[PDB]
Structure formats: C-alpha cells, structure tokens
C-alpha cells in the first residue's frame, strides 16, 4: 500500500521534479526500498534523478508528468548547464524505449524535437511504465 495516499504518481512514472532554487528536473518515481533511506511521508514520493542517480523525497505537488514537456523544459538551463543536457539524454532515452520509438548533442537533437513536439505518434501514453 506504498503511496496509497490519494495523490498522483506511482512507481516507474517519469516526472519533472521541482526543488527550491533549481529548475524542473527529470526523474523517475521509485519505491522507498530502492533508496536505502525510509518510507516516504504521506503526500510525498521518492524520486531518482536522471543524470546523477541520486534520491530525493518530493511532495506530489512538486511533481508533474514528464509528458508535459514543453511546459517544463527550461531552455535557459539547457543552454547553460551540461548536467541538464546529460539529464535530458538519459530521461528521453528511457521515454524512447518505453514508447517503442526509434531515431535514425547530436544524439539529443531528434529526441528533444520528439519530446518538444508531443512525443508523436504515441503521445504521453507511450511513456507509461510496463
């Protein structure tokens, strides 16, 4: 009954997570058992950040589906930080495999165009965990 608090987001979900002083960052919702920490408080979820693999306990109100991409993608942070560019690659690679998508900085370009364009042809349904 982990995360049975009435709030959104379950294990395996791709999300944007917001920490104070940082841009919205891509992550995956994980079970507390993967963290080596403790059970999350009601209303909170454990997430693992793409690019650095670290764990954080984040309020479900500070998470949004990764699928709301153009809405949370930060162009200024993308241009400024190589760590954000690397996080985008790992998050969009996970999204690509889940959606059954195939592509023909250079690797990132068509993945970013696919994400910004609404993850066509599956849309956001293709990012759901199996």
Which helix (H) or strand (E) is 108 found in, with range? helix 108-116
For residues 42-71, one letter each, b for 16 or more C-beta atoms within 10 angstroms of the residue's C-beta and e for the rest, the string is: eebbbbbbbbeeebbebebebbbbbbebee
Of 28, 63, 16, which Cα lies nearest the Cα of 43?
63
Which helix (H) or strand (E) is 65 found in, with range? strand 63-65
Which tokens is 6 given? Answer: 């009435």
> What is the experimental method?
X-ray
Sign of CA dihedral 17, 115, 11, 50: negative
**∠ CA 18-57-126, rounded to 5°:** 65
How far, in whole angstroms, is CA 115 from its chain's centroid? 12
Rounded distance between C-alpha atoms, residue 67 and residue 79, angstroms: 21
How far is CA 7 from each of CA 2, 3, 72, 95, rounded to the nearest angstrom?
Answer: 12, 8, 20, 23
Q: What's the resolution in A?
A: 2.0
Domains of the chain: 1-66 (2.30.30.140), 67-128 (1.10.720.50)
């Amino acid at each position: 009954s982990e995360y049975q608090d009435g709030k959104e987001f379950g294990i395996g979900d791709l999300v944007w997570g917001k920490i104070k002083g940082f841009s919205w960052w891509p992550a995956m919702v994980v079970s507390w058992k993967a963290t080596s920490k403790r059970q999350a408080m009601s209303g909170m979820r454990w997430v693992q950040w793409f690019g650095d693999g670290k764990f954080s306990e984040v309020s479900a109100d500070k998470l949004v589906a990764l699928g709301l991409f153009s809405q949370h993608f930060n162009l200024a942070t993308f241009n400024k930080l190589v760590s954000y560019r690397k996080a985008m690659y790992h998050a969009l690679e996970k999204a690509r495999v889940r959606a059954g998508k195939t592509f023909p900085e250079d690797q990132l370009k068509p993945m970013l165009e696919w994400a910004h364009g609404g993850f066509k042809p599956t849309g956001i349904e293709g990012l759901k965990p199996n």
